[PDB]
Design a protein around this nucleic acid. Structure first.
Lengths: 66, 262, 66, 66, 65, 66, 69, 262, 261, 65, 66, 66, 66, 66, 69
RNA sequence: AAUCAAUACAACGAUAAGAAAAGCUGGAGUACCAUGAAGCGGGCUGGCG
């Protein structure tokens, strides 16, 4: 976990609006409030929990650096 | 109101285009998305900031050698994705295609071989046409919209060239190429951006390297902006300025009732 | 981890949550209990939902974060 | 496994007809004959083994409580 | 594990033709030649290898055990 | 095991095998190399295939078994 | 030996900046060049940076051939 | 060019057919796939190399009892897979169905009960017809093509029999069977390979065991090659000679403008 | 390999059968469970240790009048439970039923009236058939498997008789054939012998006449009715003409099952 | 009591087969060998002991008393 | 005692067909022949003794008055 | 005791109560009378309910507590 | 009752919400208002009375001390 | 009495007995000791069984009656 | 004779604090240690302190063998 | 309209397989029958995996 944890921590700290695409093609949007090893909390209208094993890609709205 | 301006210009070498003032002209046209064809410059060659436009993004692809060919695309907004290549040699090896992915609608540029430099060029052009027809048949099932600003180097109807009787004997207006364009337009459902708002003659885009051709307006409509059938009603205006031009192909400005975003 | 306290808060407060599966089907009900692999979602009929098929957990009202 | 194993054991002992839904949406029906950590053997018209990693929801015909 | 290994062992020893459904809904047919913890060798005209993590369900044509 | 000797026999004899993915699209080529998680499939273009997406490995001709 | 082949392959793909096409399990075709990777995620970038999870990646198809170390 | 030859012959016992010289005749027909019905022999019986054909693979299924027997299928190319039975007792317990999986199109042999030996036989035949109608209604939604070399033991129209006035009073031309075939042909969209290229009479496929039937040509058409609607235009020719034959049914040869491959 | 042998023997009087040598014959058959019907002896009459078999247990029931009916059962293993009766008069008062409960499978002896001894006997037989049909419809919901070694005294098809043109005599009547077809189709029960051999001349009952023995004018009155769960486990089936000790030949059926308690 | 004890005594004296239904619905059959205040010895194949607090009803196979 | 005994005595005297319901739910029918402290004798097709501690409800077929 | 005054208050006020048996059968009506072991529930048909089979008594409206 | 009575008295005085599981399997929740020898008054949405002989386990929401 | 001498006879001879509980669960072993309410059942592990939950006691072999 | 078996057994289990398994009549299995007991209830301690009625306890199975006084 | 006004079953539903939708804030998991089933106890070393 050399890349996942720092990338998610930077996305959380910078509060960058990120778009999360699931495996079935559904597009989620919002800001990452927190995460662990298996779930990622996405905040928008409702603080919904998104499971990692269903997430395909994470697309930030602006570039970020570790 | 939603307004989008797309310009497609084949430069036949971006160096001579920049020397003739093509970049400044494009910067003065207030365009939103610009598609370039036949840049004849590699990625290392385009690294020079002289080709950069103020306030515009730049993405391009190149072949094994710069003189072989290459295309480029400009956009006012950072695209969601920029892709190149189709999956066969005639496009991947020459870098004659570049596609920019935005929200809902994607804008792409395409370069077709001239086919006049020899019989092998015509064979490669026919192979490229067949492969592109197959790709369009596979792609037409998708939901998103596509904008193909492709220099097909072939006229569709007699209204696209002057003296079609002698044009039928030269590459650009051959019967198989005309049938291929008819198939692509009708069977696949693609619509021409220019013909959806203007069905008049003398709207040429390419002229041979002869002063007599320029004098008598013996032009060929080799440049096109191919749109999915979903965007046929979004076309607002289309322009084909004869002069000033900076290559053998005239600029093609087309306006749309669409708001570009990511 | 943060999945366990979030599920505990959803369970103890009897918050009606919507669970979306990986195939896009929308479930509804209240989280009765959970463990490491399954989540028991009860409503008009008590049904067990496996975690590996869950995509998102959407509560009907905002909840306190751990 | 504090919830999955007791729930499946109760469904087995009570012989309750259960509806097992796969991840792709195909509905299965029958009674659970036996199970372990990875598979669930369903009993209906023809005895057929169902893998757990493809099960989405298990909906018994009548409610059960722990 | 507990019963799936004896289940597949019985299906192999009895050579019962079974229908193996995949996760995407595609149905396979044939006999189990051998297996381990991750793959099941479906055996008929072509001895292909089927991964367990893609097998939705195994439906034998006749009851066993 | 069984998967490792099978893939090793397929690689040694260079049998052209067809690999079917979980989404249904069939891949074609010959097995060049493999490890625990990926299988290098060589054809017109060299592509790496993940084992978690491989559904079936169907050779064009019968091969020896362990 | 979990990644005895996948990790060297991804490292070679990253060193030469080869534009690789990554096909997901749902059939969606991604493009770009791999910036970096780890044990579970793959960093892809063509116009904007993007992290891609390995558990959703089906095939990695480079646009040009490569050589194993 | 592309050419496919499929032969369907009901043998009413593979032993008597082999004793009459069926294999020696099939070896010279240059067919690609041979479908046999009513083998009346177990799978262990066909293991004998006497029934083997040079250049053909042997796959077959058998019932619980050898008297009912099963169906066999020969193929030149090794099929992708071999499947048998439909999922119900009157086909599974009797093994009256066998299907070989090829690319795009799959060939399947089918055997229906005679229905003339007692009312129970007719009831079982009607149950089999209903279950097969359900299966075809469920299967017609698929994309791949199906070729059913099925001995239905049921005539379709008056042109398929001789003296239909007396045929209506015997199993083979009853009202329910005719309605069943009409439903299968019209509502489900399945076509008959023989009628797609030849709409002529006297092309009977079965004759009663009597010298008067052979002399007076009182034959019935019990054999058919049911095809999906996608292959109705690919039928090239159909051959069904009156003699020689090795059972109560005549050999049915049908050619297609299709290349069989795996 | 799992192997279980069940023998059903209608004796029409167990005393005459024992006098003819039924016990010495059964001792050598190596069967696991023996089914006897129409013993025509009370429970006190069978208490005599002469009828006992070496290594076999003995359970039986009797009617109010022992000469009218009564069945028996032998077993190599001690069954979990021994029950009798169905819940109606034609079975309870006549003692024509005895069921031994084993693991997973239940073996039950059954006896139907002859129906040839008058119109009253035929009506009693029809009532018994209807009541047993109701019982089977109620019982088919259970999970445990049932083996009904019942001499129903009715043939099923023409293959079970000789010179069927039988239809005018009790044993092959139209309503009885319809009842058997209903039982074997709607209820889902499978005949033990017909699941492995569809051959003729395998009769089980012969009229008391030399012509019936010489010309083989026999009827199949013996059956082993199996639940649909046990139709696949039938291994062998036989109906030896001799040395039967009554008007019914012994029906030996083998199963791919290991009996346990 | 005044009714249960004479009933069970008549049942055991006449050796009438009785159907004993338990609380869960499972029916037992046999002959009552002996009884007391809490248990009823139900004898047939094996002399099992049945507790009264779990018996729902006792149904004799024939009328008594 | 103040209500149970008089109710049962009235049911026995009036010979009203009562529907006995057991704790598990198996309904019995018949007429009350006799009773005491722990058992209830119900007669219908055959006289059967019903234990009191297994009875749930008693439903007469017609109204009664004490 | 508290059961006796509670039941007496329910009786004198004629509050419709729902009685859930030990198995789970829901009975409805009004309490007419009771004693130490049985409870008389009257509705469309008069029925006697035994106390050893009653699990919960749920009135339709709040009542005074002893 | 040396243990049940003081425990129930402490739970009543502390007014701790308790979870009560019946013998039929269902769980009831509420607050203990009062109790005696045979019934327990459980107050929540409706003031329902629960019998002691039908209560299997008592689960307080938080640990208590005698 | 009958229950106590019967249990004492079962205990003295160490006869393996099968004890079917009221819910249908079957136990196996030998009787260590007993009293008025519980029976000590010996097996792989020593366990205690309550008499109020035992439905039947079925020895594996016949024994002398008290 | 009274509770000469139940009381000493439960007292030994309480003093030794051996984890015991308590099976209910409805099929639910409980685990924990007994804090104390009386004539009608048993105090069970695990994640939370819960009281179990004796009239619903079917069997009490210790996790390890024990010796009675 | 809910702990089955009292017991419990059946009712039909999976493309031998698309060289691959830069991605749709989310597709759906009826009637009828039916009153007691000889009984289904799920590793390393308390620290960790």
């Amino acid at each position: 976990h050399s890349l996942q944890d720092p990338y998610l921590n930077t996305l959380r700290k910078e509060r960058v609006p990120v778009s999360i695409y699931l495996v079935n093609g559904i597009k989620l949007q919002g800001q990452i409030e927190s995460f662990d090893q298996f779930v990622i909390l996405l905040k928008n209208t409702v603080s919904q929990m998104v499971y990692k094993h269903a997430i395909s890609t994470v697309v930030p709205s602006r570039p970020v650096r570790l | 109101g939603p307004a989008m301006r797309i310009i497609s210009v084949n430069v036949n070498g971006i160096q001579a285009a920049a020397e003739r003032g093509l970049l400044s002209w494009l910067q003065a046209q207030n365009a939103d998305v610009i598609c370039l064809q036949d840049t004849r410059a590699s990625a290392f060659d385009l690294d020079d900031p002289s080709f950069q436009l103020d306030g515009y993004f730049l993405y391009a692809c190149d072949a094994e050698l710069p003189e072989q060919g290459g295309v480029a695309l400009y956009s006012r907004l950072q695209p969601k994705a920029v892709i190149s290549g189709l999956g066969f040699e005639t496009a991947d090896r020459y870098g004659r295609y570049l596609q920019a992915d935005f929200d809902k609608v994607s804008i792409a540029t395409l370069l077709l071989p001239s086919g006049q430099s020899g019989d092998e060029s015509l064979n490669q052009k026919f192979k490229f046409m067949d492969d592109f027809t197959h790709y369009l048949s596979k792609q037409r099932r998708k939901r998103r919209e596509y904008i193909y600003c492709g220099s097909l180097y072939v006229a569709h109807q007699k209204m696209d060239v002057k003296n079609w009787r002698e044009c039928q004997q030269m590459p650009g207006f051959l019967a198989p190429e005309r049938a291929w364009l008819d198939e692509v337009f009708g069977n696949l459902g693609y619509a021409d951006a220019l013909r959806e708002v203007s069905r008049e003659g003398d709207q040429f885009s390419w002229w041979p390297d002869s002063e007599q051709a320029e004098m008598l307006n013996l032009g060929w409509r080799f440049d096109y902006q191919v749109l999915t059938p979903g965007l046929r009603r979004f076309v607002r205006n289309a322009k084909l300025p004869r002069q000033p031009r900076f290559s053998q192909h005239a600029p093609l400005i087309v306006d749309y009732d669409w708001q570009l975003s990511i």
